[PDB]
Design a protein around this nucleic acid. Sequence first.
RNA 1: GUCUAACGUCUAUGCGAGUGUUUGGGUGUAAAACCCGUACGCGUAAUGAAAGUGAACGAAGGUGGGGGCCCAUUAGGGUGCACCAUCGACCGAUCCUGAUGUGUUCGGAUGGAUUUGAGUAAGAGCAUAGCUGUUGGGACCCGAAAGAUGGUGAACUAUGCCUG
RNA 2: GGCGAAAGACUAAUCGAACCAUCUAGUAGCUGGUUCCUGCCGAAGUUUCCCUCAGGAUAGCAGAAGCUCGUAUCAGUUUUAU
RNA 3: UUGCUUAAUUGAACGUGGACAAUUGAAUGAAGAGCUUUUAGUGGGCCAUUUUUGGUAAGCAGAACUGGCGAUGCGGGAUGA
RNA 4: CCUAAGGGGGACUCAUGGAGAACAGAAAUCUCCAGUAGAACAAAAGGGUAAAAGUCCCCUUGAUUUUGAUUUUCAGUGUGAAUACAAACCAUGAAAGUGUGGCCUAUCGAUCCUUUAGUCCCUCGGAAUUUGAGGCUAGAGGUGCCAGAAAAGUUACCACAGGGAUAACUGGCUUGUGGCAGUCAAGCGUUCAUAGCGACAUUGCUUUUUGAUUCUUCGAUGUCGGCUCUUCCUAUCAUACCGAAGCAGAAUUCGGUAAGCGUUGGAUUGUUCACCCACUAAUAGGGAACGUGAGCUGGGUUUAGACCGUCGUGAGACAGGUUAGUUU
RNA 5: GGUUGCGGCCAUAUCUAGCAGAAAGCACCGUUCCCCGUUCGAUCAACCGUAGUUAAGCUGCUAAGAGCAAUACCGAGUAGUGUAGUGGGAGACCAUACGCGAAACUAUUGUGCUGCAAUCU
Lengths: 62, 103, 159, 144, 100, 185
Amino acid sequence: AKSKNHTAHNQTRKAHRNGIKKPKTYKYPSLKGVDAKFKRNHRYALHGTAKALAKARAEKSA
Amino acid sequence: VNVPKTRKTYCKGKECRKHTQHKVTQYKAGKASLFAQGKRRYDRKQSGYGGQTKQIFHKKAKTTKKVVLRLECVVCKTKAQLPLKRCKHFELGGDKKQKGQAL
Amino acid sequence: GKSRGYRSGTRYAFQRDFKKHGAIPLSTYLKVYKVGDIVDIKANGSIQKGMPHKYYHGKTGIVYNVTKSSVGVIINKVVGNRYIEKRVNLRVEHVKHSACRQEFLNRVKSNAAKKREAKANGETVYLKRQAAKPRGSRIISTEGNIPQTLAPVAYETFI
Amino acid sequence: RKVLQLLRLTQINAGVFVRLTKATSELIKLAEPYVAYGYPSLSTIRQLVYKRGFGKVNKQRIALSDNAIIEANLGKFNILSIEDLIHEIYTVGPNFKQVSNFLWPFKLSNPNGGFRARKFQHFIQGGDTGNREQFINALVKQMN
Amino acid sequence: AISKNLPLLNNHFRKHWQERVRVHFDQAGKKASRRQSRLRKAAKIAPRPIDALRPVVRAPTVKYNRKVRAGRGFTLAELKAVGIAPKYARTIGISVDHRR
Amino acid sequence: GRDHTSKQHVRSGHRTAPKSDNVYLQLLVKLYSFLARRTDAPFNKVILKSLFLSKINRPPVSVSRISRALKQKGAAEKTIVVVGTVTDDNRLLEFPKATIAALRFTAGAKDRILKNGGEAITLDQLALRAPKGQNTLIVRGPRNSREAVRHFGFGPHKGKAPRILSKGRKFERARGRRRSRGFKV
RNA sequence: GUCUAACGUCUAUGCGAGUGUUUGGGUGUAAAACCCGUACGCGUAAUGAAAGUGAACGAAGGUGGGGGCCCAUUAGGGUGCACCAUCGACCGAUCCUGAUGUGUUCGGAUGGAUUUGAGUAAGAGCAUAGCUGUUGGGACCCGAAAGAUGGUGAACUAUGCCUG
RNA sequence: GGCGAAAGACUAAUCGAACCAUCUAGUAGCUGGUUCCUGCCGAAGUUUCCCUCAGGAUAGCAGAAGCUCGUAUCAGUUUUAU
RNA sequence: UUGCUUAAUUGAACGUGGACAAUUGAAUGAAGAGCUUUUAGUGGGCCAUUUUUGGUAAGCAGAACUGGCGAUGCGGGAUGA
RNA sequence: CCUAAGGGGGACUCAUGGAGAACAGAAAUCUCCAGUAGAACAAAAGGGUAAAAGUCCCCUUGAUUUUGAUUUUCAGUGUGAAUACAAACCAUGAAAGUGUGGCCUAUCGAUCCUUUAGUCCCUCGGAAUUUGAGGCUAGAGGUGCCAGAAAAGUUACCACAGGGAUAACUGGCUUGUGGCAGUCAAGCGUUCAUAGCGACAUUGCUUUUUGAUUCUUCGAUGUCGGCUCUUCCUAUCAUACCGAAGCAGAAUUCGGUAAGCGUUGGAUUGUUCACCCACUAAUAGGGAACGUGAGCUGGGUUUAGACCGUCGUGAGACAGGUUAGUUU
RNA sequence: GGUUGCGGCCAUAUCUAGCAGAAAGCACCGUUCCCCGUUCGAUCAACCGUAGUUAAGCUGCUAAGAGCAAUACCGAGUAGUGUAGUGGGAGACCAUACGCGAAACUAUUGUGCUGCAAUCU
Ligand SMILES: CC(=O)O[C@@H]1[C@@H](O)[C@H](O[C@H]2[C@H](OC(=O)[C@H]3CC[C@@H]4[C@H](C3)O[C@@]3(C[C@H](OC(=O)/C=C/c5ccccc5)[C@H](C)CO3)[C@]43CO3)O[C@H](C)[C@@H](O)[C@@H]2OC(C)=O)O[C@H](C)[C@H]1O
Ligand SMILES: [Mg+2]
Ligand SMILES: [Mg+2]
Ligand SMILES: [Mg+2]
Ligand SMILES: [Mg+2]
Ligand SMILES: [Mg+2]
Ligand SMILES: [Mg+2]
Ligand SMILES: [Mg+2]
Ligand SMILES: [Mg+2]
Ligand SMILES: [Mg+2]
Ligand SMILES: [Mg+2]
Ligand SMILES: [Mg+2]
Ligand SMILES: [Mg+2]
Ligand SMILES: [Mg+2]
Ligand SMILES: [Mg+2]
Ligand SMILES: [Mg+2]
Ligand SMILES: [Mg+2]
Ligand SMILES: [Mg+2]
Ligand SMILES: [Mg+2]
Ligand SMILES: [Mg+2]
Ligand SMILES: [Mg+2]
Ligand SMILES: [Mg+2]
Ligand SMILES: [Mg+2]
Ligand SMILES: [Mg+2]
Ligand SMILES: [Mg+2]
Ligand SMILES: [Mg+2]
Ligand SMILES: [Mg+2]
Ligand SMILES: [Mg+2]
Ligand SMILES: [Mg+2]
Ligand SMILES: [Mg+2]
Ligand SMILES: [Mg+2]
Ligand SMILES: [Mg+2]
Ligand SMILES: [Mg+2]
Ligand SMILES: [Mg+2]
Ligand SMILES: [Mg+2]
Ligand SMILES: [Mg+2]
Ligand SMILES: [Mg+2]
Ligand SMILES: [Mg+2]
Ligand SMILES: [Mg+2]
Ligand SMILES: [Mg+2]
Ligand SMILES: [Mg+2]
Ligand SMILES: [Mg+2]
Ligand SMILES: [Mg+2]
Ligand SMILES: [Mg+2]
Ligand SMILES: [Mg+2]
Ligand SMILES: [Mg+2]
Ligand SMILES: [Mg+2]
Ligand SMILES: [Mg+2]
Ligand SMILES: [Mg+2]
Ligand SMILES: [Mg+2]
Ligand SMILES: [Mg+2]
Ligand SMILES: [Mg+2]
Ligand SMILES: [Mg+2]
Ligand SMILES: [Mg+2]
Ligand SMILES: [Mg+2]
Ligand SMILES: [Mg+2]
Ligand SMILES: [Mg+2]
Ligand SMILES: [Mg+2]
Ligand SMILES: [Mg+2]
Ligand SMILES: [Mg+2]
Ligand SMILES: [Mg+2]
Ligand SMILES: [Mg+2]
Ligand SMILES: [Mg+2]
Ligand SMILES: [Mg+2]
Ligand SMILES: [Mg+2]
Ligand SMILES: [Mg+2]
Ligand SMILES: [Mg+2]
Ligand SMILES: [Mg+2]
Ligand SMILES: [Mg+2]
Ligand SMILES: [Mg+2]
Ligand SMILES: [Mg+2]
Ligand SMILES: [Mg+2]
Ligand SMILES: [Mg+2]
Ligand SMILES: [Mg+2]
Ligand SMILES: [Mg+2]
Ligand SMILES: [Mg+2]
Ligand SMILES: [Mg+2]
Ligand SMILES: [Mg+2]
Ligand SMILES: [Mg+2]
Ligand SMILES: [Mg+2]
Ligand SMILES: [Mg+2]
Ligand SMILES: [Mg+2]
Ligand SMILES: [Mg+2]
Ligand SMILES: [Mg+2]
Ligand SMILES: [Mg+2]
Ligand SMILES: [Mg+2]
Ligand SMILES: [Mg+2]
Ligand SMILES: [Mg+2]
Ligand SMILES: [Mg+2]
Ligand SMILES: [Mg+2]
Ligand SMILES: [Mg+2]
Ligand SMILES: [Mg+2]
Ligand SMILES: [Mg+2]
Ligand SMILES: [Mg+2]
Ligand SMILES: [Mg+2]
Ligand SMILES: [Mg+2]
Ligand SMILES: [Mg+2]
Ligand SMILES: [Mg+2]
Ligand SMILES: [Mg+2]
Ligand SMILES: [Mg+2]
Ligand SMILES: [Mg+2]
Ligand SMILES: [Mg+2]
Ligand SMILES: [Mg+2]
Ligand SMILES: [Mg+2]
Ligand SMILES: [Mg+2]
Ligand SMILES: [Mg+2]
Ligand SMILES: [Mg+2]
Ligand SMILES: [Mg+2]
Ligand SMILES: [Mg+2]
Ligand SMILES: [Mg+2]
Ligand SMILES: [Mg+2]
Ligand SMILES: [Mg+2]
Ligand SMILES: [Mg+2]
Ligand SMILES: [Mg+2]
Ligand SMILES: [Mg+2]
Ligand SMILES: [Mg+2]
Ligand SMILES: [Mg+2]
Ligand SMILES: [Mg+2]
Ligand SMILES: [Mg+2]
Ligand SMILES: [Mg+2]
Ligand SMILES: [Mg+2]
Ligand SMILES: [Mg+2]
Ligand SMILES: [Mg+2]
Ligand SMILES: [Mg+2]
Ligand SMILES: [Mg+2]
Ligand SMILES: [Mg+2]
Ligand SMILES: [Mg+2]
Ligand SMILES: [Mg+2]
Ligand SMILES: [Mg+2]
Ligand SMILES: [Mg+2]
Ligand SMILES: [Mg+2]
Ligand SMILES: [Zn+2]
């Protein structure tokens, strides 16, 4: 029979009708793939930071 | 391929949890039981009329097999299995290479 | 037979520079990478572990993870009609800090310094950059520079 | 095509004012084979703004028929009259961007007298595209 | 044959199903005829009740232990306790179950 | 001819009226079309848009959501506004005295609001005591809790719910859901 | 391009942590309309192959936004539902540790783990209807060469016989 | 099945497997056809897998329903730095 | 703040508090940005300029980018996707 | 393919050249100097490597365990392969470190079934014990058409759905091939390049060859040749008028204008082609859907019968021979 | 400023041939009982600093030096190229317009700079 093998013609036309969109940026990136040892300890540091701020505000209030 | 008959690898046995000495043996597939459910189902399906009821493989392509090492711990008798790459030639505890010798 | 392996077509991309083969200068191993740093990626052919794929040779990205000998860099790659976030683990031999950050970071300092100085003097200063503008009027002196008349030259063969 | 769209030139015989720097010069260089441009005189600017001057008001093309429209849209930029707008365009002022973007692209007619025999070649080579400089005034006189 | 993100179905319609389709057009007709039969039975045996007295029994299984329902007949021990013979009880509107 | 930089003749893509033909919902739209057009109060423009929403875009608000919203600091005497149905919650231990304006109240919800000293009024009654929505607090129900959303965006390593009719060990658990059966996605 | 069984999305409607009268019973001006209720289906708990176990550290969590609302007085502050990004907590599976104790092999407290679930984290569903899309059905309409089952032909003709 | 001095010949104008009725509306990735108007939008013949190469699934292109918001921060473009 | 890290009172990450106010840090444009669900047809292509492979070449076969025809009428090329 | 050709550490430095030493020479072994790698690193090639990744030596099993994340192909699915870490357990080294197979880029494999290892855990559903069986996790047994049916032929007795998505005519592009024609002039031609020729090269034309392609036609354009008949081309065989000669005459050869006019009868062959005989002024070459089958004929080719040779186990095949075979 | 130890950049530092080098340092240098390694105390190991030397190393200077580095009214706005035309040419290819723009060549200049610690005429 024999047919067309390959062509990238018209593909940049289709990608640019609704795409070619840069990804959105967020303040906090996901920590997926970050070192487990750092991630394990970072859990304890954030929890303690919240406690200190909670107590400081609990002092202000009453 | 030449593999020594002993090896010190990690032992998964609950008693050991460490590298111990192991005895290397080539794994040999066990005998097919007649009361395995798949062999029980196969015999019933083949019975009666209908001919051969399940496919028979023909188009062999592999020319080798994967060698599996049976590692038995000398301390607790726990066995372990290790597959090797595809080798045509394989001896266990053969003569070690002698480098520097003449022809 | 088609060939499409990992390092196909990287004959010249992954080559060392001429008269620059061999051992790695140790400033490469003394640099410090922090999460959020912008780094250029350039595969070193002499270090094959932690080596980037040929796509990332010449790309610049953000460090997101720091390990014993490597950094994780986030790259945005076009896949069809959108970008996909790629997370590549690279040994620091294939990584160098991007020189773009600092120009920004010096221009930030200069703007801050200029603003306070105008604030100190009680005047105003404009900090937005401008493209090159058309030049103003000017007067050309001809003392020692009387115009010399040129003409197109005839055709000659020099072989 | 993108360059012509970003210059708001999305039809034939559409005209726009551009302040010459480097970014906009390299833009016009990209669109050069499809446009005729030049340096407009004060009378040319006045005639353009008076006859075909329109403003973008709530994304609508509104005729500049009264100075109140101009004041209501450009008084925060110190433009209170059609002559303030013309001055801001001609002597390129601090608010050229806002005043020229407020101006709807001029929709000119074809030249009275035609173009040259073949438009789509540089003005230097006997065509119409590229920079004609002071002859942009004659061309606009033909087309406006 | 398989397309899109859809649930995988089990529609058992590969036999000659259309030859065995029972449509209950006669639901109302059977309701009416059942009522007429019930009237005939009542007028046949009046003033004797149309329903035999049934016992109350616990439902089997761990799921219906809590529930209690109408049984089939009173046991021989139960009829013995009230001094009624089963042969006589069946003739005075009492249901008997020799099995329970 | 024009080189169009955007698609031509494009509808806004937002509802400008309810799809419902209920005449009484139209009366509410009648009232808040006038209010949104004339008060400059952002509350009235939000309510008019919310009256257009479809049923899945106005999820029911439990009487527990109102209790938690009234438990914000300085919000105990605010008027709770729900453009939709307010349902009961038999998991609450107690309910405060509150004024709530809603499209509909369930029997348990109306009972509970009135049992605790509160009011259960309609959205037209709101427009007279608060024509600008003063001292109000709009409460919306959970949109992503719907069952249909479980199957949205299903794919490999996406963690969504497969569209399946039966649940059990024999239903889509072997190959592609288990490393012992090839791979897992 | 239909009808039907079972379905996905969306929409309208009724009720709502419930929902669905119609299998059936009552009733009737009699296949209608009207009325009734036990069960049952789906939902309200998941997870594990299973034995089994089974959802609050906290105001049902923190951070950055967030329409609307409150206090202001450009600006600013407070409160911030839905929703988004991110870091956590709880339940089930997997792995690690293994208290008082004990049918001495059971029990599994307590504390953890780049693991894992279609979960919890102040319910959202059920039912009816409509368009569109899916699958099984003759399946948009018409179409094979074939296969099977059960019957009818040696008035033509082939061959044997009998009689001319 | 018959019958054949054998041609795959003959077996009621039917023979390399008669005729009749049924299963049967047999199946068909292949042909053909597929019935009123206007308005708006508007493609693909490309990726991967498939006894896949005249076909499917899948992604892409397109329509419809919208939803959260209202200049927030986007771009088939330029400048500067790297 | 941490159970990570340092010889450490060193760092790492996440933070409390304070300072820098509209030239808040290039241009130009922006019928606004972002998000979701669902489904059709298609999955034979071909041509022109330029880059380009096999072939002596081909109105031949095959790729790259763009624009077109296909799906498209109108004026010109007499005629012509 | 490799128990090292994997891992660690240490020491040394290859290819090659020069100058020297008994047998010893181009090649044996020894010495010095030079030696950016011109070598070696299992195997293709590319990259990489010098107090090493190369050579040699010592010790080893990290070619181990639990599983997550990531890169390539990508639908951002699978498979293969690889990367950086987490938690163990080890090897090596004084140590820092390095090591999760081979310096890097290839070296491989789902569902169902079986088997082995692990956990010695769950279940066999009226309750137990022990066999047996079934589960959970990880390997192996294999799909090479390698995202993975279980599979020999023939039909010249043939059928169906289609296809000009595709071959066998004509036609279209091309012109390799075929045919024909030029230029430059070393040579030939007794002397003498061009009366007549003309090598090595090189420029073209033609579509009567054969290729190349597959655009049209597969709901069909009747596929060879001959007979009959018309017309057209010129690259002219003869006949008209002329120019040239290595033209004395006769004869002959080259050329110009020239297609007006003619170009045959037969043996053999189905032939187109060919070859012979003979006449003739000459017996030129071609086209017109390889002109011409509702004009014929039907010898050939190419249905079904049959024979032979070779092939095949056979049914049967032959672009091999042979004979009979409806031309509406 | 010299020198040593440890370095950063990794030839402006390399290569060849000469010459010079105060002080300290470095170095060669002397020995083999001990730890250690070799065919060989040559390398490696240890001891003495005692007997000697700047001969070598090292350092600096010299060379129309090689190489390397930098610069440019050098070549050259050349080659190439993005964009354009119903431009030229039978073609091969070429010219023009708006832009970007080399390499070789030629000439000149230079020949390590520097961080921490210690030490010295
Ligand atoms: C003997 C002969 O010539 O044929 C044998 C046949 O006897 C064998 O039948 C076995 C039969 O096989 C099956 O039922 C299939 C199960 C798995 C399928 C297939 C066989 O094997 C495959 C392919 C390949 O495994 C084999 O190939 C296995 C061969 C085998 C042989 C004996 C027993 C078990 C397996 C994959 C690894 C997966 O397993 C599979 C997925 O395609 O099972 C019975 C229980 C056995 O008793 C029976 O064995 C015998 C000797 O009778 O099937 C093989 C495919 C044939 O090659
Ligand atoms: Mg094909
Ligand atoms: Mg083709
Ligand atoms: Mg195709
Ligand atoms: Mg073991
Ligand atoms: Mg069975
Ligand atoms: Mg038998
Ligand atoms: Mg059978
Ligand atoms: Mg090959
Ligand atoms: Mg290749
Ligand atoms: Mg390179
Ligand atoms: Mg490796
Ligand atoms: Mg990588
Ligand atoms: Mg200022
Ligand atoms: Mg403008
Ligand atoms: Mg005129
Ligand atoms: Mg004119
Ligand atoms: Mg003119
Ligand atoms: Mg004129
Ligand atoms: Mg003109
Ligand atoms: Mg003209
Ligand atoms: Mg005019
Ligand atoms: Mg839910
Ligand atoms: Mg009824
Ligand atoms: Mg009736
Ligand atoms: Mg119920
Ligand atoms: Mg005890
Ligand atoms: Mg005890
Ligand atoms: Mg104990
Ligand atoms: Mg206990
Ligand atoms: Mg989870
Ligand atoms: Mg929840
Ligand atoms: Mg919930
Ligand atoms: Mg049909
Ligand atoms: Mg159908
Ligand atoms: Mg259907
Ligand atoms: Mg049919
Ligand atoms: Mg059959
Ligand atoms: Mg007869
Ligand atoms: Mg029979
Ligand atoms: Mg018989
Ligand atoms: Mg025959
Ligand atoms: Mg017969
Ligand atoms: Mg008959
Ligand atoms: Mg007949
Ligand atoms: Mg007959
Ligand atoms: Mg097909
Ligand atoms: Mg349109
Ligand atoms: Mg599809
Ligand atoms: Mg695509
Ligand atoms: Mg869409
Ligand atoms: Mg934005
Ligand atoms: Mg730059
Ligand atoms: Mg702050
Ligand atoms: Mg700028
Ligand atoms: Mg679709
Ligand atoms: Mg789609
Ligand atoms: Mg689709
Ligand atoms: Mg489709
Ligand atoms: Mg095609
Ligand atoms: Mg197709
Ligand atoms: Mg074009
Ligand atoms: Mg051109
Ligand atoms: Mg092509
Ligand atoms: Mg088409
Ligand atoms: Mg067009
Ligand atoms: Mg026309
Ligand atoms: Mg035309
Ligand atoms: Mg023409
Ligand atoms: Mg090696
Ligand atoms: Mg080794
Ligand atoms: Mg080694
Ligand atoms: Mg070493
Ligand atoms: Mg292995
Ligand atoms: Mg693949
Ligand atoms: Mg993969
Ligand atoms: Mg993918
Ligand atoms: Mg992937
Ligand atoms: Mg994978
Ligand atoms: Mg390690
Ligand atoms: Mg396998
Ligand atoms: Mg039992
Ligand atoms: Mg089993
Ligand atoms: Mg399990
Ligand atoms: Mg397997
Ligand atoms: Mg295959
Ligand atoms: Mg395949
Ligand atoms: Mg097969
Ligand atoms: Mg035959
Ligand atoms: Mg044949
Ligand atoms: Mg064709
Ligand atoms: Mg030719
Ligand atoms: Mg030729
Ligand atoms: Mg031809
Ligand atoms: Mg053809
Ligand atoms: Mg045909
Ligand atoms: Mg026809
Ligand atoms: Mg034909
Ligand atoms: Mg005809
Ligand atoms: Mg023929
Ligand atoms: Mg002639
Ligand atoms: Mg004639
Ligand atoms: Mg004859
Ligand atoms: Mg003859
Ligand atoms: Mg012949
Ligand atoms: Mg023809
Ligand atoms: Mg021909
Ligand atoms: Mg013919
Ligand atoms: Mg012809
Ligand atoms: Mg004819
Ligand atoms: Mg005929
Ligand atoms: Mg003929
Ligand atoms: Mg014939
Ligand atoms: Mg014949
Ligand atoms: Mg012949
Ligand atoms: Mg025949
Ligand atoms: Mg034979
Ligand atoms: Mg034959
Ligand atoms: Mg032959
Ligand atoms: Mg005959
Ligand atoms: Mg100095
Ligand atoms: Mg000294
Ligand atoms: Mg010594
Ligand atoms: Mg020593
Ligand atoms: Mg010295
Ligand atoms: Mg000296
Ligand atoms: Mg020099
Ligand atoms: Mg050019
Ligand atoms: Mg052009
Ligand atoms: Mg022209
Ligand atoms: Mg130029
Ligand atoms: Zn052990």
